[PDB]
Scaffold this active site. Structure first.
Site, short mmCIF file in Angstrom:
data_model
loop_
_atom_site.label_atom_id
_atom_site.label_comp_id
_atom_site.label_asym_id
_atom_site.label_seq_id
_atom_site.Cartn_x
_atom_site.Cartn_y
_atom_site.Cartn_z
N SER A 126 -4.59 -0.38 3.86
CA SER A 126 -4.97 0.50 2.90
C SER A 126 -6.56 0.97 3.11
O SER A 126 -7.45 0.33 2.63
CB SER A 126 -4.85 0.53 1.44
N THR A 156 -11.81 -5.66 3.32
CA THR A 156 -10.75 -6.42 4.05
C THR A 156 -9.74 -5.43 4.63
O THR A 156 -9.46 -5.34 5.79
CB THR A 156 -10.16 -7.16 2.93
N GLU A 193 11.34 3.64 20.63
CA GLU A 193 11.71 5.01 20.77
C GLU A 193 10.73 5.92 19.91
O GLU A 193 10.26 6.86 20.47
CB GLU A 193 13.20 5.22 20.13
N1 GTP Z 1 1.00 2.74 -2.59
C1 GTP Z 1 -0.02 1.88 -3.37
N2 GTP Z 1 -1.36 2.11 -2.91
C2 GTP Z 1 -2.07 0.95 -3.73
C3 GTP Z 1 -1.58 0.05 -4.58
N3 GTP Z 1 -2.73 -0.81 -4.78
C4 GTP Z 1 -3.78 0.11 -4.49
N4 GTP Z 1 -3.54 1.02 -3.82
C5 GTP Z 1 -4.57 1.94 -3.22
O1 GTP Z 1 -5.41 1.14 -2.51
C6 GTP Z 1 -6.89 1.39 -2.84
C7 GTP Z 1 -7.30 -0.13 -3.23
O2 GTP Z 1 -7.24 -0.81 -2.15
P1 GTP Z 1 -8.58 -1.08 -1.39
O3 GTP Z 1 -9.73 -0.25 -1.88
O4 GTP Z 1 -8.40 -1.06 0.11
O5 GTP Z 1 -9.18 -2.71 -1.78
P2 GTP Z 1 -8.59 -3.94 -0.84
O6 GTP Z 1 -7.65 -4.08 0.21
O7 GTP Z 1 -8.66 -5.13 -1.78
O8 GTP Z 1 -10.36 -3.87 -0.09
P3 GTP Z 1 -11.68 -4.57 -1.02
O9 GTP Z 1 -11.92 -3.44 -1.81
O10 GTP Z 1 -12.53 -4.44 -0.05
O11 GTP Z 1 -11.25 -5.99 -1.54
C8 GTP Z 1 -6.61 1.99 -4.22
O12 GTP Z 1 -7.53 3.10 -4.24
C9 GTP Z 1 -5.32 2.38 -4.27
O13 GTP Z 1 -5.32 3.98 -4.03
C10 GTP Z 1 -0.23 -0.30 -4.47
O14 GTP Z 1 0.07 -1.30 -5.09
N5 GTP Z 1 0.56 0.75 -3.88
MG MG Z 2 -9.82 -6.34 -2.80
#
Ligand code: GTP
Ligand code: MG
Ligand code: GTP
Ligand code: MG
Lengths: 61, 38, 31, 44, 440, 37, 427
Positions: G130, G135, G244
């Protein structure tokens, strides 16, 4: 005994995957299976929402 | 009889959730469940 | 405020013209 | 004014929708001639 | 394979819809669960559900009916009552706040918001529909939802589909005792949106139901429930040949080229002759000879217009039950030789007959008795212009002092649009005068 | 100054607005799609 | 032989994996524990009936995994596979790529080799993440780059969460997402992208569920990550391998960012009254609202479309349905792609998650299309970057932490290309 038992089971399979009448009925017997699990899903969502209505009264009490 | 084996095995559990064109020719149910109410 | 309804006259011109384009199928089956 | 600017914001947001249904429709209507002529080429 | 779409608009759309869809589900087998009975399931031997009811693969029959209004206080009882699960839940559209019983809210202010949503629920139905026999519009000329929403429907449906037949069902105001004060403003202008944007529009009055309940049904306190039951029966009577076979089958495409000579006179009466209580059906014999005679009686009519001072120009008959076509041909010939029933000189044929075999069905708890045969009577009498003559003067009296008009022009209405609505209706008062005039 | 514009269709879905129409659940249909009428 | 090995990384990425393996387990039969009461692709056999999973969930910081290994499906995950750390990357591509990542860079790498060596025919990887936090930004890249050489050419698929339009749970979001593009761009294969603003709506517009969390959305993401792998796992008619999807959705090299849209996403109450047929389903995936990315297809051009049909679809109605969508003019398809319709009818009706949010449909579809509409998206997130970078905001950390301002400028030119490179595809 192995010979003739293989004979009937797999000639049963030949008319199973070729006859469209069977496939017409095989399709809807899974649609009958769908109505059971849908109504199981209908009954479950009322059961799961019964989970927090006692919790909603608990946190309010 | 391949219909017969399929209606013996995947239909008895499905009693009220049954679809429309399953039991053609009423005598199909007489060789099945004892009350069964169609 | 002045900009806000100025677009609305645009919207209504662009709305009633959409009412007029439908005024202005067979290409399969028949053709 | 912030709500008015917000209410302003939905308006050209909605104007972008009208231009899109517009442009989809000339694409939809100008072609109908092309498909009419393409079949007509077979027809003639 | 023949099939149709029945849209209901307004509170007056859904009260018949509650009192007519319970008829259709009792017509073949259908429970108020959408499920066909278990002793109908054997072999799938019924195609007479497909006209009004669709069919998901599971077995629930979903109807081709979208119920839309701006009043949420009447569809919520459908979402609560016995027929909660028959109707498809995104096919019942409700607004938060009413149309305030004025056309300007229902056509220009709020009615523009819900129209693109309900076109998508129409092309819901038409895309499942192989050959659309026609649409069935249900509304009333009371106020905003019943007249404003359907008239912008009429404008959008005529341009979406074009060359396509479409019947209409609307109740009409009173000559004497009406229940709304701003109502006569509506009927003048909504006709202007109906003259060229509607295939055919029936003549039904709720006051004749009150008086039919007085003389024929013999019931005290005529409620609104049994009022919609008779108009529930009459849509079944005209569309019975869409479901079932007959000696003279009639589809809905037959009907438009059967009654109207001009594209702006699509305004026929619609009465049901064998309407009778339980006790009184026990003593009157009901053959086709005498119930056809009861069709033309002014007491057995539908709209408060005595047909003795109006010329019959076109009619069609739809017969249901054990109807023998010979005694039909005897009964019509007695009507033709009857002097007090008058015709128009350019229509020496006049009548059209349609036969169905199945007898009418009776709702449990209903006042109608199980009659052995049924007759539906549909004519566009020229005497209906007098109803407009008693309506336009009521419109003109209120427009003379320009009363109750500030509510219209406030919600985006133009004053000059009423004048051309009156000017067009001035042609209709001359149009019926130049049709019934004898040939020279 | 937080406030959410209320819908007019009374369903839990169909978040419709007098200025945001074309905002509802797209359709069942067999032959054509939603955007090709 | 047919095998897969994911690398769920980042709070979102891992949570995504959690719901995913729930359905994975049910699809085959694995009980939460990990013992069974055609699966190798996701579950590795052992001694006594024990099918352990085949991934390597990561997370520079603890938490998440903590519960992940002490809750519900606790035993299944192998104590080792689950790799934690001891601190977060605080939404800093720097910390994630050039500061705190290094620490675990090898532990994942080494654990990965194990899962890899063990299998015999890994069809490819599945780095679910994400773009939002260190990370899930720095490390993810740091992993993909090293993996590019330690595992050689091999479907390097990836299903991540790209910043949504208005909704944004992060302030520096722009930086992290843009900075992570310059990497995958060359070290990826198919960035099946999916947002959140759109997946919320689709769960209200079609699922009638308001106030939605990140859990309901996780289930949906899954159904997609199942149909993209169902043809390799269960059986059926026309089938599609990860190899594919590549040569049928990725037209030119750089252009490698397909979208996704499950179709029969309907609740139970609504389904009992609405049929669902090859036609309807397909005639409803090309709609501009069933999209999982706010990018609207209409505003662009379909360059490819892989319509997977995990269900009892008949291989005839599908052909007819496609022919229709073809002749419509509305859905525009670039001329360079005279055809433009991959299929794939797997014969395993989708499975229903215990206490989930979807209804069991005999037929289901997940068309991953490639439209120049993702172009618009990139630019909108790009805009935010330019602004934040113009005032060098949030650069105090990022740069002065373990990286140089050069990347902050390089990522730009490279991204500026991707968007320009997308434009030419249209013309
Ligand atoms: N589809 C989906 N998206 C999610 C979920 N949880 C978080 N997200 C998305 O991911 C974002 C949070 O993930 P990150 O900001 O990358 O947090 P992280 O991966 O732990 O990275 P760090 O912040 O550095 O620790 C949020 O803004 C959400 O939009 C989930 O359970 N499902
Ligand atoms: Mg985090
Ligand atoms: N046939 C029939 N008509 C009814 C019934 N109940 C009410 N009506 C009629 O409905 C009319 C009201 O007209 P409308 O203005 O359309 O009422 P509405 O449908 O709520 O539309 P709006 O008031 O604009 O919201 C009254 O004049 C009644 O005669 C019924 O049960 N059967
Ligand atoms: Mg009212």
């Amino acid at each position: 005994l192995k010979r003739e038992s293989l004979k009937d089971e797999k000639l049963r399979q030949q008319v199973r995957e070729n006859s469209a009448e069977l496939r017409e009925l095989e399709k809807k017997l899974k649609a009958a299976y769908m109505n059971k699990e849908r109504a199981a899903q209908i009954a479950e969502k009322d059961a799961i929402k019964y989970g927090q209505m006692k919790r909603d009264a608990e946190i309010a009490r | 009889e391949e219909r017969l084996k399929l209606l013996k095995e995947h239909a008895t559990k499905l009693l009220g959730y049954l679809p429309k064109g399953v039991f053609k020719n009423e005598d199909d149910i007489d060789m099945l469940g004892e009350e069964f109410r169609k | 405020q002045a900009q806000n309804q100025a677009l609305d006259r645009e919207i209504q011109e662009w709305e009633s013209r959409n009412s007029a384009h439908s005024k202005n199928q067979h290409d399969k089956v028949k053709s | 004014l912030n709500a008015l600017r917000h209410q302003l914001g939905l308006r050209q947001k909605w104007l972008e929708e009208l231009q899109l249904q517009h442009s989809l429709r000339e694409l939809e209507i100008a072609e109908a001639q092309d498909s009419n002529t393409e079949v007509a080429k077979t027809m003639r | 394979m023949r099939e149709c779409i029945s849209v209901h608009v307004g509170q007056a759309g859904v009260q018949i819809g509650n009192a007519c869809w319970e008829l259709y589900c009792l017509e073949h087998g259908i429970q108020p669960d959408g499920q066909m009975p278990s002793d109908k399931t054997i072999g799938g031997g019924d195609d007479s559900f497909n006209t009004f009811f669709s069919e998901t693969g599971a077995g629930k029959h979903v109807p081709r009916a979208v119920f839309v209004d701006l009043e949420p206080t009447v569809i919520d009882e459908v979402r609560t009552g016995t027929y909660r699960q028959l109707f498809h839940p995104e096919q019942l559209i409700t607004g938060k706040e009413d149309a305030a019983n004025n056309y300007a809210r229902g056509h220009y202010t709020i009615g523009k918001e819900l129209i693109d949503l309900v076109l998508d629920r129409i092309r819901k139905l038409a895309d499942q529909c192989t050959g659309l026999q026609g649409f069935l519009i249900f509304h009333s000329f009371g106020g905003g939802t019943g007249s404003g929403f359907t008239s912008l429907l009429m404008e959008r449906l005529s341009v979406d589909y074009g060359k396509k037949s479409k019947l209409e069902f609307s109740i009409y105001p009173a000559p004497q005792v009406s229940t709304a004060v701003v109502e006569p403003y509506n009927s003048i202008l909504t006709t202007h949106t109906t003259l060229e944007h509607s295939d055919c529009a029936f003549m039904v009055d709720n006051e004749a139901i009150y008086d039919i309940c007085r003389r024929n049904l013999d019931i005290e306190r005529p409620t609104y429930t049994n009022l919609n039951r008779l108009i529930g029966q009459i849509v079944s009577s005209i569309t019975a040949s869409l479901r079932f076979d007959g000696a003279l089958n009639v589809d809905l495409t037959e009907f438009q080229t059967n009654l109207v000579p001009y594209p702006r006179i699509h305004f026929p009466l619609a009465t049901y002759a064998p309407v009778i209580s339980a006790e009184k059906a026990y003593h009157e014999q009901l053959s086709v000879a005498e119930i056809t005679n009861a069709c033309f009686e002014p007491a057995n009519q539908m709209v408060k217009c005595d047909p003795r001072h109006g010329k019959y120009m076109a009619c069609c008959l739809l017969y249901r039950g054990d109807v023998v076509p010979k005694d039909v041909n005897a009964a019509i010939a007695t009507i033709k030789t009857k002097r007090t029933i008058q015709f128009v000189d350019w229509c020496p044929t006049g009548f059209k007959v349609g036969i169905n075999y199945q007898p009418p069905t009776v709702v449990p708890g209903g006042d109608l008795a199980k009659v052995q045969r049924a007759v539906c009577m549909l004519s566009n009498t020229t005497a209906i212009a007098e109803a407009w003559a008693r309506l336009d003067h009521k419109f003109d009296l209120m427009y003379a002092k320009r009363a109750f008009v500030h509510w219209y022009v406030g919600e985006g209405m133009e004053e000059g649009e009423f004048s051309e609505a009156r000017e067009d209706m001035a042609a209709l008062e001359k149009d019926y005068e130049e049709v019934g005039m004898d040939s020279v | 100054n937080v406030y959410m514009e209320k819908s007019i269709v009374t369903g839990p879905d169909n978040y419709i607005t007098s200025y945001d129409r074309l905002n509802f659940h797209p359709s069942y249909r067999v032959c054509r799609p939603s955007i090709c009428d």
